[PDB]
Design a protein around this nucleic acid. Sequence first.
DNA 1: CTGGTAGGCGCCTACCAG
DNA 2: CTGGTAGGCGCCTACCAG
DNA 3: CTGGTAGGCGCCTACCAG
DNA 4: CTGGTAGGCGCCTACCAG
Lengths: 408, 411, 106, 106
Amino acid sequence: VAREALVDLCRRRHFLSGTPQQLSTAALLSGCHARFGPLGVELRKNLASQWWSSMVVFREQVFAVDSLHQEPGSSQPRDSAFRLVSPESIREILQDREPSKEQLVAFLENLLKTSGKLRATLLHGALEHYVNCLDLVNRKLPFGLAQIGVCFHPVTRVGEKTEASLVWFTPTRTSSQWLDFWLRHRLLWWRKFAMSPSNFSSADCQDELGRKGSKLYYSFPWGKEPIETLWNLGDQELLHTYPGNVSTIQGRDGRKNVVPCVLSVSGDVDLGTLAYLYDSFQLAELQRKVLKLHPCLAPIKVALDVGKGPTVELRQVCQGLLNELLENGISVWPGYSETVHSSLEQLHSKYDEMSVLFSVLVTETTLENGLIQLRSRDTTMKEMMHISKLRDFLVKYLASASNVAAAL
Amino acid sequence: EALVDLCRRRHFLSGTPQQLSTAALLSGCHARFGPLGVELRKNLASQWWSSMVVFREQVFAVDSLHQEPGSSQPRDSAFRLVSPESIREILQDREPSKEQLVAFLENLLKTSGKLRATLLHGALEHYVNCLDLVNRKLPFGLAQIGVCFHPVSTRVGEKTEASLVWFTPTRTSSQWLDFWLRHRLLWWRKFAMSPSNFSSADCQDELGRKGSKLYYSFPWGKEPIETLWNLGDQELLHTYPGNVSTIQGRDGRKNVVPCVLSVSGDVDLGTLAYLYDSFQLAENSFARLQRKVLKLHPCLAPIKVALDVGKGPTVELRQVCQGLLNELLENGISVWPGYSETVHSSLEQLHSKYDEMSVLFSVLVTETTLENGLIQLRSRDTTMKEMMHISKLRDFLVKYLASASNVAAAL
Amino acid sequence: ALDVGKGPTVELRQVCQGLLNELLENGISVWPGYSETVHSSLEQLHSKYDEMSVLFSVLVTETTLENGLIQLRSRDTTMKEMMHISKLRDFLVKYLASASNVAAAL
Amino acid sequence: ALDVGKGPTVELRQVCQGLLNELLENGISVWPGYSETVHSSLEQLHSKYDEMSVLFSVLVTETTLENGLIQLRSRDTTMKEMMHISKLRDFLVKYLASASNVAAAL
DNA sequence: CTGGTAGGCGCCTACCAG
DNA sequence: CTGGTAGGCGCCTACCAG
DNA sequence: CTGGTAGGCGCCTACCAG
DNA sequence: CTGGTAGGCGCCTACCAG
Ligand code: NA
Ligand code: NA
C-alpha cells in the first residue's frame, strides 16, 4: 500500500522507468533493466558526484583509474561470470565447413578457456593499475585508486549495478586503522544526505578465509539490504596479480620497504539511489506527497513558471533568469516552456513529487518592481523576493546545505 | 612518437610499449588512460554534457544497459553473453550427441544477449517514457555517455561514446541535422590549438541516408571521431511495432511520427586528438632552448594549479600550502600537491614536469610568503613568473577559467 | 609598433612598409617607429611603447631577410617571441578578436 | 533587411533573430523588419527598402525551415536569388569588402 | 487569492485566386 | 506553385465564484 | 614488553659556484 | 637567481637495560 505509492510516484515523475512487472522489489534489486528515468539518472549523477568529492577530491593520495568491463578468461571452476563469445566464431564452424562431434566439444571447451568474461567487481582493475600508480606517488605509501563503473552479476539473466570502488593500498602496520577510518567515513557519507540517518547501519563480517570486513545496510520497508562492503584483503590478490620479484611492488612505509595490504571499499550506487528515494518519501501538510531529497542530491533545484501577465514579456524574463542560474551551476526546470497550462495546486504537487527545492513564479508584478514568488519545498512557505537576489540565495542555500552535512 | 612516450611518462596513457602503438591505441582493447588521462576525459565529457544537455532546450538524460536482447540477425557481429554454467551443463552432465550440440549453439545465437555497439537503441527504448515527460511536444532529444563494444580484426575493444538522439519532425529534420553538425564541429575547435585539424565530410549509409562525419588530422592521417546520421523513422517503427498513435509527437499542432537523428562522438579518441593537438615545442627563452609542453585548453587541462614550497621553514610553508589547497579545491580548482612529495626537485625539473603534465599554473610558497604573503606564479603558456599576493590567487584562477570558458563560447 | 634592428636600414624599412600596409588593411593600428631616424636604444624604445600602451612591439632584423623571422615583444609580459613575419597578421587579428570577446562576457 | 514570408511567424522570427545576431557580430547593419507586426506586401516592402537604400533584402520562409534556403533580393538589380542561409554572412562580408577594394582603386 | 470564463481587437494563419 | 488580403485565432482584461 | 635517556638525525642558514 | 653543500643545535628515533 505505502511502498506501492512510492514506486508509482517515482514512475509517474520519471525517477524510475519500466513496466509494472519491472517495478517490483525483486526486479529493482536484481538490476536486470534500466531502472532510472531522466530524473533518476540526474539523482544518481549527483550521488556519484558527491561520492567522488568526498572520496577522491578532498582525500589525500587518492587517484582515478580506468579499467575495461572485460577481464581475461580462464578455467577456474564455477566462476559464473558471463563469457564473451564472437557470433562469427560460432557461425565460422556451422556454415564454413561441416564439423565433427569431437570438433564441436573442443569449441565449447576453448570457450571456457579463452573467451573473456564480464567483470563482477572493480578490484581487479585497480590491482592491474597499481604498479603504474606506484611510480606516480614515488612509491610512497599509502595511496588509493578509485573508480565508478558498471559491474555484472549473475541472477539465465545478467544484472548490472553501478559500483563506486576505492582500493586502498596501505601497510599492514596501519591496515586495521585505515579500514576503521574508511568505515566511519563511508557511514557518515550515507547519513549526511538522509532524512532518517538511523536507517543506515553497519555490521561486521568475515569471508571464507577469515578476513575481517564490514558491510553497510539501508532499512528498506521489506528489510535491510547491503549497499556497501569493506574488506581487508591483505596481500593475497596483489601477489597473484604481479607474480615474480616482489621488489617491483614494494612500497615505502616511511623508511621500510613493505608489500602493501589491500583494502577494498565497494558501494552500490544504483541501490543507494533507491535508498534515498525511500528515505525522501514523507507525507506532510490535508496530506501531500513530497520527496525531500537532500539539496545536494535533488536533481532539480528550481522550477520557473509564469503567472498572469503578457506571456511574451514574462517568458523573456524567465529565459534570462534560467540562463543566469544554469551559468551558476543551478539546475532549472523550464516549466514556462511547457505549452500545457497548470494551476498552482497542480504545479505545487508536481514539483513536490519531483523533489524540486524551490518554485519560482514570474508575474506581471515582476515586470513592474522585479519581485518574484518563491515557494519552498520543505516548508510550503511562499515569499516575495527581488529577482536580482534569487541567484545569490540559491547559491548560498546549496553552499550552506553542503556544509551542514560536512560538520555531521 | 615522442608524445606517446611523454604521455606514458606523465601518466596520461597507460600500458606496455606494445599496446602503446598507433594500431593498439585506436583499437581500444586495453585501458588506455592513466590518472591524468582519466581526468582529461572526464573534463571532456563534462564539457560535452554542458553544451549538449545543460544549455540545450528539451534534451534529457537516458540510462540504458550494456546488454541488448539477442536475435538471429546474420549481419550482427556483436559479442554474445553466454552463461558458463549452461556450457558445463552440456559438457559434464551427460555424453551429448552432434544434434544436441548444434541445437545448443543455434539456441544461443537466437536467445543469448549481446553487448551493445551504439547508444541508439537505448534512447529509442526510452522514447515513449520521455514523450510523456515533454507532453508529446516535439522536438526533444535523449543524451547518454557510455562505453560501447566493437569487434577488432578475436578480441573486443571498448570505446566511450557520447550520444545524442534527436527526435524531430521530418519537416525540419534536415535543418536540425545541419544545426547539430555546425554545433559539434564548433565544440571540437573551441578547445583546439589547431582547429583546422578538425574537419567535416558528408557520407551515406547502405540505404542512402544522408549524414556527416567529423575527423581529426592525426600525424598518420584523418580518423573519424564523430558521426551524425539522419535515420528517418525506420528504427523507431521497429522498436514500437503496432499502433502509431502511441509514438506520434506534436509538431506545433500536427501529430506526426518523428524523424530520428543520431549524433554519436568518440570520447576516447577525442582525448587522444587533444593530446596530439596540445603538443608543441615552445621555448622558455630562445636565447638562454626548446621545451616539451602540453598546451591543453584550460577547460580540459586535468590539473589547474600545482603547489610547491621553496626556501624557508618546511613546517610553516606546508601549512600555508594545505590551507591554500583547500581553498582552491573548495572553488572547483584541481590542485597538484607537489609540496606533499618527499623527493626534492629543482625548479627546472619542476617546470618541465608541470609543463609536460599540462599544469596551467605553478605556485611556489617561500619564506617571503610568510612575511608579506606573496607567492610565485608561473604560467604554462608564456613561462613567465610573477609575484602575487596569496589572497588574490583564488580570484585570479576562477576568473582565468571563466574567461577561457567564455572565448570558447564565442567561437 | 614596427621598428628595425641590426642590418641594412634601407631593405629593412622596405619590409616594414609592406608589413604596415598589410596590418592597416586589417584594421590594426600601427606605430611606424622604423620611419624615425633618431638614435634610440631598446630600453628607451621599450619604455616608450610601454608608456604609450602599445600592445605588441615588432622588430625587423637581418634574420628576417634570411628566414623571415621577426621578434615580437608583449607589453603585458615583456616576453620576446620569434615568429614568421607571414603569421603576424593572423596572430594579431586573433588576439584582438579574443580580447573583444573576453570583455563581451563581463 | 530581414523579413519573414509564409510560415509560422514565431519559428520564422527565431531564425531571423539568430541571423540578425550573426550579421551584427560581423559588422553588418541589419534592419529588423521581421519584428514588425503590421502586414506589408512584397511590392510595398521592396519599395521601402529601395527608398531606404538598403543593399539587400532577405526573406525567411517555411522553405528555410526545411532546406535552409532564403530569398535574397539585390537593390541595384531587383533580382531574386535563392541561397543557403549559412552562406549569407560570407556573401555580405565579401560583397562589402569587394566594394571597398574597388573604390580604393579609384 | 486563485481559477474558470466571456469577449473586444490586433496579430497571425491560411484561404484561394493567378 | 506564390503572394495578397480575408478572416480565423489567441492574447489580455475584467468580472465572478468558491 | 616498557620506558627513560643516549645519541642519531634532520632542519635551517650561511657560504660558494655557475 | 638558484642549486649543491657543510655543520651547529634542537628535535626525534630507538637504543637497551629492567
Ligand atoms: Na487562414
Ligand atoms: Na635511536
